[PDB]
């Protein structure tokens, strides 16, 4: 074994420093500093043309390890399979690495995420769903690791390149960004994640809440100069305003997935415009006239009726529609995100409410003093 | 000297609730348990706490007073911070009325052997109907004193206000062997 590493000492910056350094830990029957060192040297920036050399050593270090952390082992085999780039035998390699550690240690889930990742390129539809399902059901009893969840949500985001994954991709991307907090990746990757999450939200048939536009740290902090319009558009989709100037602004860019869906985007804009316009109502004159809707959503007076019908049918409005006066009665079961000024105003309203309650309670106890007992 | 009719038993609210709950739970079978607390003085019996004991096939009797369970629970409650001493024993008489049978008499002298002022508490769970808690406290009088022209207990005061006892105790020989102790439940404001 020492001769094997001596003859293959090359292919590393500072030929001794790359391999004999971890050999120094190896000779002293050590497997924790050694695994960290080999992890770091795998992450060392190289083509890793010596991968064919490391595997045997890895196999050697896998033949009588009996101490190495399975999580570090799978973290190294994912890089190994990324480097070797032979999907035909990769599947067997991951399967045998998974079977060689069958203990209760939760490293198998990472291997399942890896086989899903390398499997979402060839044969990505028939049984990859089974892989995702077994991963998610096995994802139980230990939510504090936060790495296996990250891998599962990475796989789910990988699945986004399908016909019917827009809102679900948005939810899983939210879960991923919740799992990993700090930067720990280039600004380009983070802004790409925020961008894809944004287009998922705009195209999400089942999502219109957009409560994380100004609440999610990633997209709010990112994208100040590089195609920043997205956050602005998100603001529009939370402001309900016309702002179709911004819609065309993002129409010049991102021509695919938006030029073909401009119609659905306009319908979504109109629905959120209805939501905003009856949110701005003073809560006493909740009735909405036809002309204000027509002039706000810049739609004909014969379409407001069907628009509010669609909004009520979806489950965001619980009002009613009149026609002789054509005033749409309004009641709400679909809340929204607040803001500092809105919170201040609404807590002032609550203070008024509590003052009225206290005044009537005082009057009641004063008038009913004798009967009280 | 002779005990006084002014003597009364202070039962904490928790103790009373525990005894009634155990009596209902063990119905129709008769249960029993120790009565932790402190005598404090001659005229008071403070029942701070009561803990149930496992039910044995012999029923309420001395062989069902397994010392392993009692000793372990006593020392370990004192470890928690409850260092009381046994002041008596409660037991259940469902549908019988508050009185002592012969076996209860043997258990009561066995209890008086180590603690002279032990108290036997009888609770009727089924008879403890809403708004009526049938509970009584007794202590044995040996035949030697009462036969020898001596009153079983001196009435130094007017605390003998305890009304005419239920005739069931009279048929079961209340005053012949076990003088009843007037009851006084102690309730804190919390």
């Amino acid at each position: 074994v020492p001769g094997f590493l001596q003859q293959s000492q090359n292919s590393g910056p500072g030929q001794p420093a790359v391999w004999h350094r971890l050999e120094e830990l190896y000779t002293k029957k050590l497997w924790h500093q050694l695994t960290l060192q080999v992890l770091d040297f795998v992450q060392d920036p190289c083509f890793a043309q010596g991968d064919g050399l490391i595997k045997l050593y890895e196999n050697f270090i896998s033949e009588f390890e009996h101490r190495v952390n399975p999580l570090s082992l799978v973290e190294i085999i994912l890089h190994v399979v990324r480097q070797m780039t032979d999907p035909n035998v990769a599947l067997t390699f991951l399967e045998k690495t998974r079977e060689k550690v069958k203990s209760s240690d939760e490293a198998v889930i990472l291997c399942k995420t890896a086989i899903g990742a390398l499997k979402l390129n060839i044969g990505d539809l028939q049984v990859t769903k089974e892989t995702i399902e077994d991963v998610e059901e096995m994802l139980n009893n230990l939510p504090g690791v936060t790495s296996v969840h990250s891998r599962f949500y990475d796989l789910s985001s990988k699945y986004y390149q399908t016909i019917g994954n827009h809102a679900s991709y948005y939810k899983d991307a939210l879960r991923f960004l919740g799992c990993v907090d700090i930067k720990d990746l280039p600004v380009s990757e983070q802004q790409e994640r925020a961008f894809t999450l944004g287009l998922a939200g705009l195209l999400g048939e089942g999502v219109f809440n957009f409560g994380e536009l100004l609440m999610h740290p990633v997209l709010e902090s990112l994208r100040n100069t590089d195609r920043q319009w997205l956050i602005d558009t998100l603001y529009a989709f939370n402001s309900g305003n016309v702002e179709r100037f911004q819609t065309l602004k993002t129409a010049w860019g991102q021509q695919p997935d938006l030029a073909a869906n401009e119609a659905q985007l306009l319908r979504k804009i109109q629905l959120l415009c209805l939501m905003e316009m009856t949110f701005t109502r003073p809560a006493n004159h909740r009735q909405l006239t036809f002309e204000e809707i027509a002039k706000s959503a810049k739609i004909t007076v014969n379409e407001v009726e069907l628009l509010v019908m669609k909004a009520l049918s979806v489950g965001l409005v619980k009002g009613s529609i009149d026609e002789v006066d054509k005033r749409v009665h309004m009641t709400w079961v679909q809340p929204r995100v607040l803001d500092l000024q809105q919170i201040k105003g609404m807590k002032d309203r609550l203070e008024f409410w509590c003052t009225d309650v206290k005044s009537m309670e005082m009057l009641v106890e004063h008038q009913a003093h004798d009967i009280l007992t | 000297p002779a005990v006084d009719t002014a003597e009364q038993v202070y039962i904490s609210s928790l103790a009373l609730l525990k005894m009634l709950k155990h009596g209902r739970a063990g119905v129709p079978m008769e249960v029993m348990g120790l009565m932790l607390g402190e005598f404090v003085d001659d005229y008071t019996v403070r029942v701070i706490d009561v803990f149930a004991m496992p039910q044995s096939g012999t029923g309420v009797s001395v062989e069902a007073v397994d010392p392993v369970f009692q000793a372990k629970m006593l020392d370990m409650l004192k470890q928690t911070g409850r260092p009381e001493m046994v002041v008596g024993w409660y037991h259940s008489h469902p549908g019988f009325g508050c009185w002592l049978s012969g076996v209860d008499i043997n258990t009561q002298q066995s209890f008086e052997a180590l603690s002279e002022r032990a108290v036997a508490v009888v609770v009727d769970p089924i008879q403890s109907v809403k708004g009526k808690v049938v509970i009584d406290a007794f202590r044995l009088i040996n035949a030697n004193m009462m036969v020898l022209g001596h009153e079983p207990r001196q009435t130094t005061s007017n605390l003998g206000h305890l009304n005419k006892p239920s005739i069931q105790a009279l048929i079961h020989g209340l005053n012949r062997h076990y003088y009843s102790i007037t009851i006084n439940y102690r309730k804190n404001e919390l």
């Binding site: 002293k28 924790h32 500093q33 050694l34 101490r67 | -």
Partner: protein, 191 residues
């Protein structure tokens, strides 16, 4: 023959997952607790021993019980996937020792330091001063990879008891193949 309570502190951090000692440090430390508790209890059968783990938590899996069997029971399947927090380990050891059932047993602490200790110097010296003010004897023994003869640890044991005290030892182990024979020659026979 001296009445005492032994409050052992074992380690199950990830740093016990390299074969520096024996097959691995887990069985080395298990046999170490075995022999030390054996010596303590055959020295006096009226004593009692317990164990606290230290990896990212501090569990009291076995309280202060005379029967060593429970300590041997919970020493098993320790699953070394944690991180050592020595600052709270000795604190919880003393806080469990103050729950002593007998009021005549003497203080005695054994802690299994197998990982480097990430503690402030002021924090450890004030811990030692508090131990002085509360009259608790602590013996620290070091295994595995570790900065040999820690200045913080040697100061901690020096100010644990000063000015001609009993002499609570700071025991280090020779790296490589070595049992606790050195750990029983000096420390076990005399404290």
């Amino acid at each position: 023959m001296v009445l005492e309570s032994t409050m052992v502190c074992v380690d199950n951090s990830e740093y016990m997952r390299n074969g520096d000692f024996l097959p691995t440090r887990l069985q080395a430390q298990q046999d170490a607790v075995n022999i030390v508790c054996h010596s303590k209890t055959r020295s006096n059968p009226e004593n009692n021993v317990g164990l606290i783990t230290l990896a990212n938590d501090c569990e009291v899996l076995t309280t202060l019980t005379p029967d060593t069997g429970r300590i041997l029971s919970k020493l098993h399947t320790v699953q070394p996937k944690g991180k050592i927090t020595f600052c709270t380990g000795i604190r919880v050891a003393h806080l469990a020792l103050k729950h002593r059932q007998g009021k005549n047993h003497k203080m005695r602490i054994i802690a299994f330091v197998g990982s480097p200790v990430e503690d402030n110097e002021k924090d450890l010296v004030k811990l030692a001063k508090r131990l002085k003010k509360e009259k608790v004897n602590v013996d620290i023994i070091n295994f595995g990879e570790e900065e040999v003869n820690t200045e913080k640890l040697t100061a901690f044991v020096n100010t644990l008891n000063g000015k001609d005290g009993t002499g609570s030892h700071l025991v280090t182990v020779p790296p490589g193949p070595s049992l606790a024979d050195a750990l029983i020659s000096s420390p076990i026979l005399a404290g």
